[PDB]
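Researcher: We plan to redesign the surface later, but first we want a full-length starting point. Tokens attached.
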């Protein structure tokens, strides 16, 4: 059955790595389900992010399915980190009332997995990270129109980022995450590797 957590931690569940974090404001429940699945609920949350994926990110055909709901500022994104350089990155497929990162630091565009994304770079100064209190860039691909479920071919994003001088370091984790900020909502997301699909043919 499910395992529902409310405090920040990482682990492996159903065969998949997961990461979950919250600041402890408001309410959030992160429920680990069979295989690549998790569900979540949040109510008037301060901030949280979490999902299932890979302990070591990289070039991958990520595949995910499920549902994502919010009345406020929440988003659904492949979410991960590198070190040397320290980078926090996002490939955002859907959001609520606020399209991240509010247009800040626009760099260009990329086409991947059937859709156009806008590319941004933002900066975090003296901020908590996977390597402690640091100054680091955040890289974003944000879909021009919302999508919930599909493939995210990470290499296409990384390569576009690189074309704009947004270079990555050594991969740390990479998860298909739900995020909330001063908002309420729910999600139900199942992650998989997309490489076992039939060959595309039209």
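Model: Full-length starting sequence:
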């Amino acid at each position: 059955a499910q395992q529902c957590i409310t405090s920040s931690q990482t682990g492996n569940h159903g065969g998949y790595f997961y990461s979950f974090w919250t600041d402890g404001g408001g309410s959030v429940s992160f429920c680990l389900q069979n295989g690549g699945r998790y569900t979540s609920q949040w109510s008037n949350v301060g901030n949280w992010v979490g999902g299932k994926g890979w302990q070591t990110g990289g070039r991958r055909v990520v595949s995910y399915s499920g549902t994502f709901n919010t009345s406020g500022n929440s988003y659904l994104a492949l979410y991960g980190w590198t070190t040397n350089p320290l980078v926090e990155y996002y490939i955002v497929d859907s959001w609520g009332t606020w399209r991240p990162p509010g247009g800040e630091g626009y760099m260009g565009t990329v086409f991947s997995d059937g859709g156009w994304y806008d590319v941004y770079r933002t900066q975090r100064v003296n901020a908590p990270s996977i390597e402690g209190i640091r100054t680091f860039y955040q890289y974003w691909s944000v879909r021009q129109q919302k999508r919930v479920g599909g493939t995210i071919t990470t290499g296409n994003h990384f390569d576009a980022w690189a074309s704009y001088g947004m270079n990555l370091g050594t991969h740390n984790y990479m998860v298909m995450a739900t995020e909330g900020f001063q908002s309420s909502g729910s999600s139900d997301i199942t992650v998989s590797d997309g490489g076992s699909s039939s060959l595309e043919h039209h």
